[PDB]
């Protein structure tokens, strides 16, 4: 039996085909979100990768910012619910989930059943989201996928004074003009993001286990900086960007059984 | 006697030479601010215009973000004080001053003596400042100096949902690709700034007369949107970007008069 989960976010589309509600047999991420062909391309690839087709998929659930714009799913479900479900599937005793995506940062507090108890989100400021990193990566002319590894080489982190993405961009341009080492600039960029999200997490009250998800959690430098700022161990799935899609796939499995 | 005021902000350098504390005989704005050659260029132009030299200026006061980086002044004075002094010299009965500059927006409430009663500033965020406008002007490919006139033609302003400069830029890009009328895009951009600064004004409590200063006050579209959002008439000086430098020049005059009053001049 197979179900599918689709998470169409501001920035990327993620898909998972789940086997018997327990085994991920295919996952795919396309860095095109709401308002693009990203969803279609994710599907194409999940199908090519598995050999399956739409007919073989008993239930599909879509989540994320673009979920109501998608008309080919059995249910459209909140990404708060889907990320919580996906994380709880992988990591026991999760009480705090930090989802840093392309346009917002979400912090979920869960009870002992995995149900939402409290929630705080920054969705109004590009700083402390993936958008900040995307902007900086473009200026430094490296892929966001390299920022973690680059920051590892830092021995003399540059401080970024500005908390605003726009003002920070100017600072980074100025550091680049002063021939600051790219690894130190990037380390400072990671610290800026971690300070802004950490403030968010501290307002809700850290409770272990603390789990980071979202595409930004693929950046090892951000995760390290975050664990430093919140002074708590952070657990990151090997598939942090796909937890919403996985959670959708699990709700899809619930639907398929109910049928 | 002549005195000089320099206002070295984040974005532009402004200078005024004032004669006998009453007549502006020269002014100059260069769109390079702190950390640049802006200040030296301002000086060159004031001196060129007037045919004066440093030795002819009795007192110099510097203000603005860059004031402490400047070492050739007699005093370095707060830009809150300098804008208030400059505005009060030009516009009687002023009680609210809105200074929208290149990196922050300041709202000053003054008492009946021109002294600061209350103050709010948005300073950490590019939105609601000249930076926001400079960013948008670049994207829509018009000069910031044309925004005011363009916006006059708007009849159905576009919506900008985002309050963040970065997210708003993406909306403006989308509007341009959707072929929305430029004047309606510009009106929406103005409304974004005005909503953000008007929230500060409303928090402090609007009190007439309300005066707008700073380089952004040269944008008539921002002035109109602000007056709309605060539901109050706004007065703009003829030289809104220069009120800080004027205030500095007036404090410089005060210094000069203080020096004169501490001696006696005896002749027969
Ligand atoms: N390989 C990578 N390494 C590090 N960071 C990455 C990588 N790929 C993407 N990112 C970051 O991940 C972000 C997108 O994460 P993602 O969780 O897919 O956002 P989204 O769900 O589309 N947006 P939202 O609506 O905010 O949830 C981008 O903005 C990048 O900064
Ligand atoms: N001719 C013009 N028409 C409309 N707007 C203008 C014009 N010239 C400059 N501006 C705006 O005015 C700005 C700078 O204003 P100004 O008050 O000189 O800032 P500043 O004092 O250097 N910075 P701050 O440190 O924040 O006070 C730019 O960011 C522009 O948006
Ligand atoms: S601080 Fe900068 S990044 Fe944050 S909302 Fe303001 S303009 Fe956007
Ligand atoms: Mg997401
Ligand atoms: Mg100023
Ligand atoms: Na992943
Ligand atoms: Na200017
Ligand atoms: Na002016």
Swiss-Prot record, chain B:
GO terms for molecular function: 4 iron, 4 sulfur cluster binding; ATP binding; hydrolase activity; metal ion binding. The keyword Transmembrane does not apply. Its cofactor is [4Fe-4S] cluster. It is an enzyme of class 3 (hydrolase). [4Fe-4S] cluster binds at residues 125, 164. It comes from the Bacteria. Its EC number is 3.-.-.-. InterPro entries: ATPase_BadF (IPR002731), ATPase_NBD (IPR043129), CoA_E_activase_dom (IPR008275), Dehydratase_Activator_Redct (IPR051805). Binds 1 [4Fe-4S] cluster per dimer. It holds the Pfam family BcrAD_BadFG. Keywords: 4Fe-4S, ATP-binding, Hydrolase, Iron, Iron-sulfur, Metal-binding, Nucleotide-binding, Plasmid. Gene3D superfamilies: 3.30.420.40. The keyword Hydrolase applies. GO terms for biological process: L-leucine metabolic process. ATP binds at residues 10-14, 102-104, 134, 215, 241. Belongs to the HadI activator family. Homodimer. Involved in the reductive branch of L-leucine fermentation. Required for the activation of (R)-2-hydroxyisocaproyl-CoA dehydratase. The reduced activator transfers one electron to the dehydratase concomitant with hydrolysis of ATP. This protein is extremely sensitive towards oxygen. This is 2-hydroxyisocaproyl-CoA dehydratase activator. It comes from Clostridioides difficile. The lineage of its organism: Bacteria, Bacillati, Bacillota, Clostridia, Peptostreptococcales.
């Amino acid at each position: 039996m197979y179900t599918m989960g689709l998470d169409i976010g501001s920035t990327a589309s993620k898909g998972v085909i789940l086997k018997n509600g327990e085994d991920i047999v295919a996952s795919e991420t396309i860095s095109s979100g709401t308002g693009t062909t990203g969803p279609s391309r994710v599907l194409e690839k999940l199908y090519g990768k598995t050999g399956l087709a739409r007919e073989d998929i008993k239930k599909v659930v879509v989540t994320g910012y673009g979920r109501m714009n998608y008309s080919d799913a059995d249910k459209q479900i909140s990404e708060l619910s889907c990320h919580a479900r996906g994380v709880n599937f992988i990591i026991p005793e999760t009480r705090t989930i930090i989802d840093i995506g392309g346009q917002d940062a979400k912090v979920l507090k869960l009870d002992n059943n995995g149900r939402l108890l409290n929630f705080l989100m920054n969705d109004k400021c590009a700083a402390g989201t993936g958008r900040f990193l995307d902007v900086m990566a473009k200026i430094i002319e490296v892929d966001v996928s390299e920022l973690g590894s680059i920051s590892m080489n830092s021995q003399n982190e540059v401080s970024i004074s500005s908390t605003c993405t726009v003002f920070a961009e100017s600072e980074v341009i100025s550091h680049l003009s002063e021939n600051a080492k790219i690894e130190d600039i990037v380390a400072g960029i990671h610290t800026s993001v971690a300070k802004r999200v950490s403030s968010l997490v501290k307002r809700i009250g850290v409770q272990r286990n603390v789990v980071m998800v979202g595409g930004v959690a693929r950046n090892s430098g951000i995760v390290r900086a975050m664990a430093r700022e919140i002074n708590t161990e952070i657990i990151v799935p090997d598939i942090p960007q796909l937890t919403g899609a996985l959670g959708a796939a699990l709700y899809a499995f619930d639907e398929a059984k109910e049928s």
